Each structure stands twice: as C-alpha cells, then as structure tokens.
Amino acid sequence: EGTLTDHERKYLNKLIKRNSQNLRSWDLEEEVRDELEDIQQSILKDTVSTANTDRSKRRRFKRKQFKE
Amino acid sequence: EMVIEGGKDRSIEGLCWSNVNGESLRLFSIGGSTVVTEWDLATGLPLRNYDCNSGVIWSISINDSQDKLSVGCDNGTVVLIDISGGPGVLEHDTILMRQEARVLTLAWKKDDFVIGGCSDGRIRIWSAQKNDENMGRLLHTMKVDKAKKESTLVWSVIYLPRTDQIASGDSTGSIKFWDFQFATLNQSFKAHDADVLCLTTDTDNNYVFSAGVDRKIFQFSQNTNKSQKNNRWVNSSNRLLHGNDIRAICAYQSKGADFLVSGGVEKTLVINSLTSFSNGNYRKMPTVEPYSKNVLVNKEQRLVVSWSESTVKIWTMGNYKLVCKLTLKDDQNISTCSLSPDGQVLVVGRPSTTKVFHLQPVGNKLKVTKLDNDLLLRTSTKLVKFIDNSKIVICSCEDDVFIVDLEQEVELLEVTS
Amino acid sequence: SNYVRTLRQIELKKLEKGAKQLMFKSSGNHTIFVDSREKMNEFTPEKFFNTTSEMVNRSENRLTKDQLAPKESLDKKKLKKFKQVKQHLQRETQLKQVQQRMDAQRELLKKGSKKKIVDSSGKISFKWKKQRKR
Amino acid sequence: NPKAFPLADAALTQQILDVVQQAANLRQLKKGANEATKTLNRGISEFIIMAADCEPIEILLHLPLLCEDKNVPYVFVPSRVALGRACGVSRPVIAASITTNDASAIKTQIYAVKDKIETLL
Amino acid sequence: VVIEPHRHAGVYIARGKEDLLVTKNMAPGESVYGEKRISVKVEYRVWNPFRSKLAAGIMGGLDELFIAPGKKVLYLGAASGTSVSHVSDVVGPEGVVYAVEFSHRPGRELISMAKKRPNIIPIIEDARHPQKYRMLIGMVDCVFADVAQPDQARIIALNSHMFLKDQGGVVISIKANCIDSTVDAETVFAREVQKLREERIKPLEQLTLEPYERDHCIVVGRYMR
Amino acid sequence: SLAKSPASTIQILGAEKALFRALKTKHDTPKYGLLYHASLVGQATGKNKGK
Amino acid sequence: GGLPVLYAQETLIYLKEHGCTELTNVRASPQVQNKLLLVIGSLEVILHSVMPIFTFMGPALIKNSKGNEKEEMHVPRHRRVKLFSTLVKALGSFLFLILVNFKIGEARILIEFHVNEELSGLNDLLDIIKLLTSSKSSSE
Amino acid sequence: YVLTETSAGYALLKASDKKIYKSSSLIQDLDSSDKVLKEFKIAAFSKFNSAANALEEANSIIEGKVSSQLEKLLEEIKKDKKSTLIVSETKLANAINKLGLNFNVVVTLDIYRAIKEYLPELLPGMSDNDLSKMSLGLAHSIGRHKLKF
Amino acid sequence: IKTKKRKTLKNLRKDSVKRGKFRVQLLSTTQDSKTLPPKKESSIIRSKDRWLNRKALNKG
C-alpha cells in the first residue's frame, strides 16, 4: 500500500526476470518441442475419436437438407 | 384494440392463447430463434421471454384446459412447459423422446397425447401424460408418401375429437386423415395442388377446412348419417378468393356468429362462414385500418411526416419535393411520431425510449439535430400531440401525462374493474 | 491367435497405464467477456494477463507479477517416454493387423457353403450364402 | 420393465434391426451378454443392442454401467426373440455388440444409426 | 519431481523428468482411482484432464478461478465422484466441498470416498430441489456445474441464487451435444452465456478445452444479486 | 465389481498365472479357475467337469 | 425493550434520563441495553462513566461502540480505567490502540503479576508505531 | 416483529428478525445485509433441536425432504402461536402443509440467504466447523439411507 | 467516401476483436432486450420461405 517503486520497481523487475528464467529453464525445449507436440497431438488424435464426431455432425446436418 | 409492433430481427411465426377460466389471458409467440415470448395483457409488452432448453422453436400448441404448452424445436426435440399460476410463471417439466427430423406442428388430443408433424415426411405421436408410467415417449410413427425426386415435409397437423381422427396436410397437398387409435390412415385426398399450411374445424367435427399455398380454401364434410356411421368425409366444396397464398386460417362458432378467417403472404384478410362456406357470403377486409397512425401533416412549410417502423420520412408540398429521412436504428421499434406547431421539434416514439429532433429548414431540405432530454428518453411513451412549440405532452403506459422540454406531472384519475 | 490378442491387450494396458501418467499439451480456444467499447478498443493487454510478457504463450499454469516476484536430458528422457508410447501404439496397430488376418483364417473354416467372390482390388473378398444357423 | 431406460420405437427399432441384420450378414457382430461385455472391455464394439424382455432384466442391465463408463451407445429393443432372429441364430438373444472395421460395407449406415442412438442418449 | 504452485493453492505442477499436474492429499496412502503418487515425504495426486473436466480447465487457466483453499465449494456436477476428490485436495480441511448427485450408480462410490475423506459432504437428492436439501448446506462460497441434462443454466441459476452468496462465483462446463446437437459450438455457447447474463451472472470467460474433450466449453461468472 | 464381468472370467477367476503362462508359451489353457472347488464340478467326473 | 427500540428509532432520528438508562443497562437484553447506552453516549460524563463499569463486568459490535465511546472521550485517567477494565488480548489490543504509558504499565503489571507472555507481547508488534512502543516501554 | 423458521442441523430455528411483517419481506436487501447489521436485526429466539441421534435425524429428514409433519416441529409450532404473528416459512413445497395450521405464515428467499449466511457466526452460538461436522455427519448418516436402500 | 464510410461503419458495429491470443465480447441492453425481446434465426426462416418459394412449383 505504499507504492514506492523508485528502486523497488527495478528490484522487483530483476527478481521477476531471474525467477521467470529459473522457472522456465526446467520446463521444455523449443528445438525438439515441435516434434514432442506433434507426437502428443498424434497420440491425442488416436485416443480421441472426434473424427467420428465430425462425421456425426455431418450425418446430423444432412438430415435437415430437404433434398432440393 | 391493440397493435404490439416489433422492429427488425424478429418475427411471429406462431402464437397461442391461454385463458384459464376466471383469470387473465396470456398469449405466447415464437421468435425465429429458440425463445418463446409470453406477452402480457396489462399493457401489451412482454412479461416473459422464456428460453426452452433445446433446438430452435418452430411451432407451439396449447394443451387442453390450457395448462401445458408443447414447444417443437429444430434438432428434433419437443419440449413441454407447464403453466402453474398463470402470468409470468413457467416451468418446463419434460423433454419428450428425441428424433432427428425437425418438428413442424403440434396438437393435443386432450391432456393426454401430443401429435407432431415432422420434417422427414412423417407424423409422430407422443404420449404426454402424467399419472402414467409411459410419458415423454412416442407411441406411433405414421409415414406420408414422398415425391419421386423430392423430399416432402408435412406442414400442418390437427386433431378431430369426435370422429377420433387426425388431419394432416403436407408439402404434396395430400390431405390425409389418420385414425387415432390403431395409428392407421383412414382417407386421403390429393385435391390441393401445392403445399398445405393450415386447417381447422368446428365443435363436433362436422367439417374441416383446409388451405395452403394454392390460395384455395376448401371443405370436407362429415355431416350426414351415412358419413357419421361409416365415418366418411367428402370433398364437398372448394373456393379460391385470394391473391398469393394462405399461411394461416382459424375458425370460430357461436350462437351469434359462425365464421372463419384466413390470411396469407398477401397482406389481406378474408372472412367466410363455416356452415355456409359454399352457400353464404364473402367478406374481404382492407389491407390497413389505421387505428395506428403512420402519417401526420403540418401546415407550416406545407409538409408531411410518414413514419415506418424504426424509420421516418418527411417531405413538402410544392407539386412536391422530397426533403429528408431518418432511419434511427437506435430506435428499435416505432410508435407515434409528431411534429410541433411552427415546424420546429419532432418526437419519434418507442414504448420506453422516445427521441426528439429539432428540424431546421435550411432551404430546399431540412437539417436535423438531436436533443436529449433524459426524462423523455426513459419514460414510457405512447402518444404526443403538441399544444405548444417548446413543451411536449407525454402519454404513459402507466396511465400518466407529462409536460417536458424546457429546462412536469398531469395526474389522471382512478379506474374501476 | 490366442496369444496374439492377449499380448495385444498386455501392451494396450501398458499404453493406457503410460497415458494415465503422461501429460498432454493444451490448445482449446479462449474468450474473455467484456462490457463496453471503452474497455474493448484496447484489447485485454499483457496487464490483463497480469504477467511478464514471455510467460504468456502457455495455456497451462502461469502466474502473475504478484506471485512471480538438469541441462537437457530431462527433455531427452521425456522424448524417450513419448517415443515409447508411440512405438507401443504402432506395434499395437501392426500386431492387430496380423491378428485380424489370423482371425479371418480361423473364421474361414467353420461351416456353410460358398462360391468364391473376388473383387477388382486384388485382396480376396468374402461372400457366402444366407441362412439362419441351425 | 421401468428400469430398461433407453427403449426404442418402431422406426428406430426397425432401422437398428436392419443394420444388425446386415452386420450379421457380413459377420462382424457378437452375440450374447458376456461376449458383449468382452467387447466393451477390449473396446472393439461400436455399440450395443439389448433386449428389454429378459426375465429378470438384471441379467442384462449390468453392461449399461460399464457401457456408459466407456461411453458406448446402447439401446433396448422390446423382444429377445426378435433380435435373435435378427442376429441369425435360432435362439432368444439377450444382447449383441457390433464390432468395427473401417473397410466395412455397412459403415455409413452404422454411423447413421449410432448418431440416431446418441440423439436420445 | 519439483512442485510448482498455481495462483490457487491446491493445484500444482509436478515437473522434471516427467512434467504433469498434481494436487494435494486430504487422504494419505493411495491414489483412490489408480494414478501415480508423486513423493517429495509430501504426497501429490495426478488427475487426468481427460477423465476430469475441471482439470482440463486448469490446462485452460483463468484470470480468477473461484476455487481457493478456504473457499467453500458446491459441486452439482456429473454423478461420478472423481473430480470432487481433487476439489477437496485443492480446498484442504478448512474449506469444504458439497457434492450433490442424484443417480446413485456413482452415489455408492461417492459415499465410499467421502467416508475416508471428511472434506466432502454428499447430498443425494436431485440437482433441482435445493429447497429439499436446504438443511444440509449453508451459504456456499462457490459453485461448479457439470450437469448434462438440458436445463443447465436454469437449474444452476436456481442453485446459485439459493445457496451461493452475494458476489460469489460460478464455474460451469457447458456441453454442446447434451443440450443441443446439430447446432455449432460458439452458437450454443453464446446462447448459454446469453441466458446466464439474462440471469445477471456476469460472465468472465469461456473456453472450449478442445484436445482433452470435444465441444464442451467452460464458462465462469461473477455473481451479482 | 465382479457383477460387471463376463462369465468366461468367472470360469477362470482362480487359475490366473496358469492361464497367463499357458497363453505366454503357445500352450493350452486351464479350465477350472477357482471354481473347481464347487460341489457340482466336483461331482462331475472327467472333462465334462470342465464343461 | 419497547423503550430501547424507540431509542433506536430516536438514534436514527438529557443527562439525567441517560443516567437512569445507564442504570437500566447496569440492571441479550443487557447487551442491547449496553449498546443503547453507548448510542445515548454517541448521540455527557456521569452516564458514560457509569456505563464504563457496566461494560467492564459483562456483542463485538457493542465492543466497537465502546471503541466509539473511547474515541468520543483526564484522558490519561480514563485510559487507565479502560486499560484496567480490558487487562481478552483482542479487546486489550483494540482498546489500547483506541496513555501508552498506562498501556505498557498495565502490560508490565500483567506480565509481572504461564503461557501468556508472547501473547499480548505481540500486541506491541501489532500496534508498532514510530513512538508508541518505545515511549510506552520508557514510561512503564 | 416476526419469527422465522429455518432447519439448520437437526432443528427448527426460530430467528427473530425485528422488522415489519411486510417491509422485511419487501426490501430485504436495502436492509443492509451485513454481519453486525443483520445480526442485530435477526436475533436468536428459539432452536427446537431434538438430539444428535439418528432417530431425531430421521424425524428431521421426514420434516425436510417431505412436508413438515415432525412432532418436534409441532412442539416448536406451539411456542410462538399466540398472536397470529408473521412466522416466515422456509420450504415452498412444504408451504400448504405449513398453512394447514392456525398461524400467519409468510425475496423471502433473500432473507433466508441472509439468515443462512449469519447463522454459524452467532445465531445458535455454535461453531462453524462443528456445524459443518454435524452436517456432513447428517449427510453420511441418513441422507444416503433415506434415498438408497 | 462511400467505401471508406462503409468500412468505418464496419469499424463501429463490430464486437469480438481477435488480437493475438484470443477474442472478446461485448454485452446488450437488458431492459431493452426485455421489452423488445425476440431474436430471429434468419437462416432458418429463410430456408423455410425459400422452400416455400421452391424452384419446382409455379409461383409468379
């Protein structure tokens, strides 16, 4: 509630920079992360049969087409 | 006695009455999206916009003794709403058994069974009956014939109580009479040459009158002893007294009157009789009967204001000269419009949000400028008739009169019941 | 065949017990309700994300400034786990193909009488005569 | 049986008996309650038809539980002997699963009828 | 193997040689559904964003999600007692979750987990008569909804104006197909947001949580009396 | 939790490792499970006790 | 009861009758009468001084009204009376925050007169000001 | 000038909200629904709590999930019925059964919201954690047995 | 002036700006959407009246 921010702004910004670097330096790597996300999306597409839901939406939309 | 007008982005493609005996009426309309709108009768401005849970509503029917309301949506669903108390109060209690064709028209036998013509060329019947272990489910599915290379759609379905029948008209014209129990066809008539859209009857089902987009209203009769023993209907009479189409008919009987009324995509309205459809007279009404105004004139600068819905158009008298127009879409629907004496301030109305414009004659045309009084902008407005040029008389939908527009209250007395 | 379908479900439950412990990334699509144009003409900025503008491109656990104020072999072993799951699924599809072939070779010989029916593709088709099975 | 919850009617029961007839015609369905649960376990079955006529019905209604736990469609027809004649054996059949391959000659009507089942859940 | 805090204390990231999401334990010993326990001493339970629905909403994230470790939670929800265990694990022993389900096919497993977990209060009437379950609940500080039967907004509206306090918070998984198939995602979602703001719950956020399950969003809302 | 089981499993709910090893090597499965200690299959004599 | 509800209406809208009303508050009816005595004070020495002992012996809103009376209230003697009345620790800290000499004197008399040393020694860490704790310990 | 009935743990709590019989029903949120304010408005009057036994829990369950026919509810009914005063009724389905008695029963949902939010602070005097413990005990004890088999 | 003025009308009457990560949404007038409620699904009603004004039949 004081809002000093004279040098505390630079101190908190340097602390946020170092903490964000130390936190994000243990999660993932952008050199193999594309291949990892592609493998993850492929196994997710195998595990979720939402293409059957897309054919289902087509089959439930074709019933209201009136054959004009 | 009342016009409840709406602006753009809306239609009433179906409405229903409800009068439990001894209490107020309530009529219910169908917006083009999945809402039912229960309008009031205290002022003519809606007290509910209920959202039935499913689809997009096509048509609603009333239960017998007006207790429930069958609501036929687009995805296949038919939703049932209960009325427990009358005005404003609405609970739904069941969604019925779901199919894949779009529902088009519903009707009730009694408080027991609902009948729905769908969009596959089939007429379903569901059992909507409490105190019974078989509700929310369809009992039978009767099928109407298709075309050779065209999918047909049964539009209209009604019930026949005494001769225990249902009459179904479709997009081939084939008015087919099915029997209620045994779920079977009884008769067929391919006399209509277009898409049937509507049909009604009388009290003990001596007749049934149908119409659709062949602009022909025609009759079927069941009056004589042979017809009521064999349960037989004859294509008795036929009659074309229309211009383009029919999209609605209904009929009424009393001991003081016996007449039906029809209207279509043509804006006219016709009145025939039931017991003398071929025999008796024929009554056309005019296309407009302006208890609701749309035109005022004013003597100064010799000009005339004509307001459409959400719109106004002003022009002078020469020959003639077109002056100006205002499509104030921020005013969503219109009401009374009036221009002051000496041609200075005009009021465009709306039953909660009216506006006023100073119109300055700048020669060949009129320059418009807004002016924004807040009390004027949020009061409920029905009529303005302009004593002076500065002040403005305000009618209210709460039975009051105000005086505004120079920077208050005119009280009117009590009402019996 | 009787062993092939059981080893199929062995590595199926191995793949599912791997997937119940493995975590997948997150895409969706996002939407924030706003009220008027004075708040809308600025899109909801990095201050509405309330966080430092590098830890914004994740839909996962991300903090604000208030809560915000081992070399590569971790990710290499993670890719080993991902390739383990994907090779499990590929071996699943391969051995279920050979299991379907030997399933057809089992069910070819039960009972009935057929003329042979072959189509224009090259793989042999399957059409018998029709009767209830006594 | 009031506990036989999704029970069909004439149009949809006729459609599902036709498609189970074609599935037995090319022989990719399974006949029987425990075989239906086997297919539910190993994830092969596209959907389940059952008979709301079995005495008692709790010989059948266990597979609804794991069927909704594995989110498979499941329907009741009101006659065991009717879907037994449909599945093409000479016995009253209580339940039948329909398996799946994507090279199937009844694939599109299988998908149509399973969306028809899921429209009433 | 290292534990990262979210904005809400009770949801953590167990990341390292494997990276995933965990919660706390209001019951020690064992994963009650069959997942892995991360050990740090301190135990951590995975919860799959597939087999849960709120968990994938954490994989969506929020500016302010109304589940806090003192915030009393109501859970109309799906009938399974799976995700209420982790709502308990988030809220800790000082808050409390009230899980209300009607179909007693997972009512028995709900009773089974809630016997060994005193953080959960099991209500076993319908989700449509809080007038009937008044006396087992008082002034919850949040509600969550995962009902699929198609009067979602109206019945969580009645629950939220009977039991959720003033200026509280609602969080709903709005289904598409379980209320309206044949009509698209954002259409039925904007319809639901329309009827929510008609019921004067101020909406804050909707998102579809696509790769975890198909076409069911989550909407969240401040309450205004 | 055993109500939601096929009757095949209830035929073999005791002879687990014998069943799984007789799958593992391409050999022949058992036929009793735990159910062999029931009185009716005790009274049957032969391989009709497996039946 | 009825006279106290009418006094609440009058507070929404005299020293001798206030002294009789403080005697009646000395006689949750007494809690409402004590809050009514504080309302008669806030809406004036003898009745308020009689009300001080009447609040010394025997809700939290009436405690806040006692804080309102202490704010409306020589001052070292009255603060000595309030500190002798209040010295649990919550009311002690609030009535000390609302004579830091007499506050720390009451605290030292308590801590010199078993597990209540860190409690109400943390009352200083609660009411830590630029001169309050230091001048209080100095004057004690 | 009213008494209200609300069932809380095993009981019938008559809470005395000292306002008008119609204006406390009418305004009810401009009555400053705050802790001290609604605490001084809704004061504690009576709490017919039978026991902590499961038989008293059964009487409470029958009085709650069905219409009010509890003998303890009748004993609490014969405790303020001498002036035809405003007794604010809680349930809406047990309202006709509440009206079937010689009394004057009566946004009232919002005064019950206020009564519910300021119950466990002061209105029986009991504990927050103890009220939640009694409630979870009630739910695990007899809600599951009266729905289930 | 015509094209640019129509595009400024487009800039005015537009919600849901997709700026980077996601999009937004505005709200509506509550009392006005009460007194003049009904939204119309113009696609469904235009499919209805187009099938009524079918290609095959003879309207003139």
From Swiss-Prot, chain A:
It is found in: Nucleus, Nucleolus. Its main location: nucleus. GO terms for cellular component: nucleolus. Keywords: Nucleus, Phosphoprotein, Transcription, Transcription regulation. Disulfide bonds: none annotated. The keyword Signal does not apply. Belongs to the RRT14 family. Present with 3670 molecules/cell in log phase SD medium. This is Regulator of rDNA transcription protein 14. It comes from Saccharomyces cerevisiae (strain ATCC 204508 / S288c). The chain holds residues 104 to 171 of 206 of the full protein.
Curated annotation (Swiss-Prot), chain C:
Residues 103-134 are annotated as: Disordered. Keywords: Nucleus, Ribonucleoprotein, Ribosome biogenesis, rRNA processing. GO terms for biological process: endonucleolytic cleavage in 5'-ETS of tricistronic rRNA transcript (SSU-rRNA, 5.8S rRNA, LSU-rRNA); endonucleolytic cleavage in ITS1 to separate SSU-rRNA from 5.8S rRNA and LSU-rRNA from tricistronic rRNA transcript (SSU-rRNA, 5.8S rRNA, LSU-rRNA); endonucleolytic cleavage to generate mature 5'-end of SSU-rRNA from (SSU-rRNA, 5.8S rRNA, LSU-rRNA); maturation of SSU-rRNA; rRNA processing; translation. The keyword Transmembrane does not apply. It is found in: Nucleus, Nucleolus. GO terms for cellular component: nucleolus; nucleoplasm; small-subunit processome; sno(s)RNA-containing ribonucleoprotein complex. Its main location: nucleus. It comes from the Eukaryota. Belongs to the UTP11 family. Involved in nucleolar processing of pre-18S ribosomal RNA. Component of the ribosomal small subunit (SSU) processome composed of at least 40 protein subunits and snoRNA U3. Interacts with snoRNA U3. Interacts with EBP2, FAF1, MPP10, RPS16A and RRP14. This is U3 small nucleolar RNA-associated protein 11. The chain holds residues 104 to 250 of 250 of the full protein.
From Swiss-Prot, chain D:
Keywords: mRNA processing, mRNA splicing, Nucleus, Ribonucleoprotein, Ribosome biogenesis, RNA-binding, rRNA processing, Spliceosome. Its main location: nucleus. SUPFAM superfamilies: L30e-like. Changing V77L: Impairs binding to U4 snRNA, but not U3 snoRNA, and causes pre rRNA processing defects and an accumulation of unspliced U3 snoRNA. GO terms for cellular component: box C/D methylation guide snoRNP complex; nucleolus; nucleoplasm; nucleus; precatalytic spliceosome; small-subunit processome; spliceosomal complex; U4 snRNP. One of its GO terms (biological process) is maturation of SSU-rRNA. One of its GO terms (molecular function) is U4 snRNA binding. PROSITE patterns: RIBOSOMAL_L7AE. Belongs to the eukaryotic ribosomal protein eL8 family. Common component of the spliceosome and rRNA processing machinery. In association with the spliceosomal U4/U6.U5 tri-snRNP particle, required for splicing of pre-mRNA. In association with box C/D snoRNPs, required for processing of pre-ribosomal RNA (rRNA) and site-specific 2'-O-methylation of substrate RNAs. Essential for the accumulation and stability of U4 snRNA, U6 snRNA, and box C/D snoRNAs. This is 13 kDa ribonucleoprotein-associated protein. It comes from Saccharomyces cerevisiae (strain ATCC 204508 / S288c) (Baker's yeast). The gene is SNU13.
Curated annotation (Swiss-Prot), chain F:
Signal peptide: none annotated. It is found in: Nucleus, Nucleolus. Present with 34700 molecules/cell in log phase SD medium. Required for pre-18S rRNA processing. May bind microtubules. Belongs to the NOP5/NOP56 family. Interacts with SIK1/NOP56 and NOP1. Interacts with the trimethylguanosine synthase TGS1. Component of the ribosomal small subunit (SSU) processome composed of at least 40 protein subunits and snoRNA U3. This is Nucleolar protein 58. It comes from Saccharomyces cerevisiae (strain ATCC 204508 / S288c) (Baker's yeast). The lineage of its organism: Eukaryota, Fungi, Dikarya, Ascomycota, Saccharomycotina. The chain holds residues 308 to 358 of 511 of the full protein.
